[PDB]
């Protein structure tokens, strides 16, 4: 009966744990001992984007590493010119309650969605000049928390109904749906190869998926609280997650376990965003303590503090070329570090 | 600066629009609806006329109200309640026909982001509770309570029980009783909002 199935599941979980422990020959910090530290990584506020009036919730860099799109609960989505600090597009939204935004790698479309259970798609290159709504991805049950782009057609979204979904912008239908989580899926990160993507969910576990087949490949445990943000390592062979337990963890796809956990007794705030550098040496992770720290990804040691915000940071993402490190926070100010 | 001057011109021309839109939108009084399932929030929001957030807005006595009914978000409220940190007042409803909403009230009033917001409590379904008390004693829903069994005292006792969950002096629970058949809700909301506006404005200037 169901007891036999439960016993089989327990045996399978024990086998998975034994296999994962078998491959743990040594810790990451054991191997990375003989590498010289990065020293002080202090950065200064080179630019400041003083254009918002309410809390800023997301900021995604453009493909050319010069245009930044910021989504705020003031009811506007603004595309920032990071060099001249000018505003190039002010997009009035439908529902002011937004929680994520995305810049397409082609630089044509901008996706913004939130508590309205709709992941809107905006067209920047309209021949009429003004930005218009090209599609409204209705169909979700819970709130949409993270949207990312594969191309100008296929957009992957994560919501609070424990399900992620691959959409087709040209048709407005859920081409593929993903299930297996038991809580609100809050974060998403498409891999550089655009064939895999991991999702962070409020079940304190991170799950990997395949975009084409649509079947979950692996699962990762260890977090004691909900995962608030996640991102791939630039090499595509690892990913780091930031949970509300004031810890940042590093997981390897080919190891199926946790590599290093970034923690400090001083910090107890809730991590809200993580992002690597171009070379994978620095993991700039946000915090709820009004300051964004900088973590040496290999030595698991702090390198500097990016303080300067009057409130908690909500997003921190580096550019494609790795020249700047943008931040966004609840104080309606976006600061560009370097 | 060949044509970048025109870029700066456009940037200023839309920064002005952002500032004007924000100033215009600051005139609205944000309100948040809350309560249990079938707890009478729908009828009170329908009395003023006009599955994500269902926003209802109405203008009453030169004030523009915005009501946010979040009953459609059947998810973990911990991850999205902070979006309403700037709400002027929380409108919380409890049906007296059924104790089940006490935990929800405690969670809302003890929440970190709502330590300075005034929870306008409503007690709807007055006549149903009265008829239930007239038929059966009010002690059925409150086994601990063994006081006088009358509607006029049971209502006061339940109001005291709900108000006992407050833990801060900066917020005042403007209780009220409704029977889902009177248009007195608007006046109570208006009076409470005026009081909260006065309190917040005085606190901002340091006089409070």
């Amino acid at each position: 009966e169901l007891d036999q199935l439960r016993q089989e599941a327990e045996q399978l979980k024990n086998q998975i744990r034994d296999a994962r422990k078998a491959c743990a020959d040594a810790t990451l910090s054991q191997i990375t001992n003989n590498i010289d530290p990065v020293g002080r990584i202090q950065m200064r506020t080179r630019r400041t984007l003083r254009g918002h009036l309410a809390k800023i919730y997301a900021m995604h860099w453009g493909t050319d590493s010069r245009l930044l799109v910021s989504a705020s609960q003031d009811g506007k989505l603004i595309i920032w010119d990071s060099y001249t600090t000018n505003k190039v597009h002010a997009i009035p939204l439908r529902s002011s309650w937004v929680m994520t935004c995305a810049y397409a790698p082609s630089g044509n479309y901008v996706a913004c969605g939130g508590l309205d259970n709709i992941c809107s798609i905006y067209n920047l290159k309209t021949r009429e000049g003004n930005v218009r709504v090209s599609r409204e991805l209705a169909g979700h049950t819970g709130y949409l928390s993270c949207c990312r782009f594969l191309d100008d057609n296929q957009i992957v979204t994560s919501s609070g109904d424990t399900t992620c979904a691959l959409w087709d912008i040209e048709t407005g239908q859920q081409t593929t749906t993903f299930t297996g989580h038991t809580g609100d899926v809050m974060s998403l990160s498409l891999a550089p190869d655009t064939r895999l993507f991991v999702s962070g969910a409020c079940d304190a576990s991170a799950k990997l998926w395949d975009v084409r087949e649509g079947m979950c490949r692996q699962t990762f445990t260890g977090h004691e609280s909900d995962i608030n943000a996640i991102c791939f390592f630039p090499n595509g062979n690892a990913f780091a997650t930031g949970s509300d337990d004031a810890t940042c963890r590093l997981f390897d796809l080919r190891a199926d376990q946790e590599l290093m956990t970034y923690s400090h007794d001083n910090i107890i705030c809730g991590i809200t965003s993580v992002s690597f550098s171009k070379s994978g040496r620095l993991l700039l992770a946000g915090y709820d303590d009004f300051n964004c720290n900088v973590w040496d990804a290999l030595k698991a040691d702090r390198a500097g503090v990016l303080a300067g915000h009057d409130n908690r940071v909500s997003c921190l993402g580096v550019t494609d070329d790795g020249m700047a490190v943008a931040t966004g926070s609840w104080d309606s100010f976006l600061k560009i570090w370097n | 600066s060949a044509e970048e001057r025109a870029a700066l011109e456009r940037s200023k021309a839309i920064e002005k629009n952002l500032k004007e839109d924000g100033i215009s939108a600051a005139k609205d009084v944000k309100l948040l609806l809350l309560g249990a399932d079938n707890s009478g929030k729908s009828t009170i929001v329908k009395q003023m006329k006009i599955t994500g957030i269902v926003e209802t807005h109405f203008t009453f006595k030169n004030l523009h109200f915005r009501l946010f009914d979040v009953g459609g978000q059947r998810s973990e409220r911990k991850k999205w309640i902070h979006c309403f940190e700037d709400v002027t007042a929380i409108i919380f409803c409890v049906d007296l026909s059924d104790h089940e909403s006490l935990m929800l009230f405690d969670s809302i009033c003890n929440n970190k982001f709502f330590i300075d917001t005034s929870i306008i409590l409503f007690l709807n379904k007055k006549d149903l509770f009265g008829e239930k008390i007239k038929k059966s004693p009010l002690t059925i829903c409150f086994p601990e309570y063994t006081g006088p069994n009358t509607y006029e005292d049971a209502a006061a006792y339940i109001q005291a029980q709900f108000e006992s969950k407050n833990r801060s002096p900066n917020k005042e629970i403007y209780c009220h009783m409704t029977c889902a058949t009177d248009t007195n809700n608007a006046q109570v909301i208006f009076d409470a909002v005026t009081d909260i506006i006065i309190a917040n404005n005085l606190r901002g200037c340091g006089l409070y």
Partner: single-chain antibody, 229 residues
Framework: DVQLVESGGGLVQPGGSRKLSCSAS????????MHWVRQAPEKGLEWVAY????????YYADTVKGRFTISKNTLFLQMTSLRSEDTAMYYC??????????????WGQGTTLTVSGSDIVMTQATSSVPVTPGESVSISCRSS???????????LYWFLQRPGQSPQLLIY???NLASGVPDRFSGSGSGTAFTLTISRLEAEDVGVYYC?????????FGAGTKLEL
């Protein structure tokens, strides 16, 4: 579709006044900065005026300022004190300026009007290049100053004017290609010398080619190369 129709031109006695107007539809004209470009009956294009979005900054050409005034969805060029040298065909042109924008990306049908100093001069080496279909062609244009600004954007624009039609943009900022133009066209250069390259020249791509810069006002055009069949 996008349409820029205009009227008000015609024959007028010298010394009078006339009000040529441009009508805009199909796009958010309120966020667009309309220009005004004219071409003599037997010469090349000549920049005339410019008004920005929101009526912010208004410019005029050296031989224009004083008698021309530029001011829903309608652009006005109120004109007075008309002399015999003013006769030309005036084109209504739109443009928006932001990062990666496409200025001068659309031209109106034009109107016909007849009368009874330190500028960056631009000249073209050849004014006539015979060519046959299927063979690559090339047009050249040179300036009097380097167009390469400090930020690296060489404000050199290329325009194509098929006979009996309004000009259509082909290359903007000397390296980018507009929308709707086939990938056969190309533009390249360095500082002062510009070359427009066409590979596998189709018959429909016949017409005169005009060269423009946008580094400073007035926007002096070139003499125009008539790539003829």
């Amino acid at each position: 579709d996008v349409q820029l129709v205009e009227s008000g031109g015609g024959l007028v006695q010298p010394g009078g006044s006339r009000k040529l107007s441009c009508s805009a539809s199909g796009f958010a004209f309120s966020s667009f900065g309309m220009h005004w470009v004219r071409q003599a009956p037997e010469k090349g294009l000549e920049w005339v005026a410019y008004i920005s979005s929101g009526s912010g900054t208004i410019y005029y050409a050296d031989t224009v300022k004083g008698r021309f005034t530029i001011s829903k969805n309608t652009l006005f060029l109120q004109m007075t004190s008309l002399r015999s040298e003013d006769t030309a065909m005036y084109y209504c042109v739109r443009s928006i300026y932001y990062y990666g924008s496409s200025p001068f990306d659309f031209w109106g049908q034009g109107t016909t009007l007849t009368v009874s100093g330190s500028d960056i001069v631009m000249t073209q080496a050849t004014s006539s290049v015979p060519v046959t279909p299927g063979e690559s062609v090339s047009i050249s244009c040179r300036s009097s100053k380097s167009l390469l600004h400090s930020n690296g954007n060489t404000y050199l624009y290329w325009f194509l004017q098929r006979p009996g039609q309004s000009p259509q943009l082909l290359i903007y900022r000397m390296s980018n290609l507009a929308s709707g133009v086939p990938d056969r066209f190309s533009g390249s250069g360095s500082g002062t010398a510009f070359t427009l390259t066409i590979s596998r020249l189709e018959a429909e791509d016949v017409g005169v080619y005009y060269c423009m810069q946008h580094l400073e006002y007035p926007l002096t055009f070139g003499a125009g190369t008539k790539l003829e069949l």
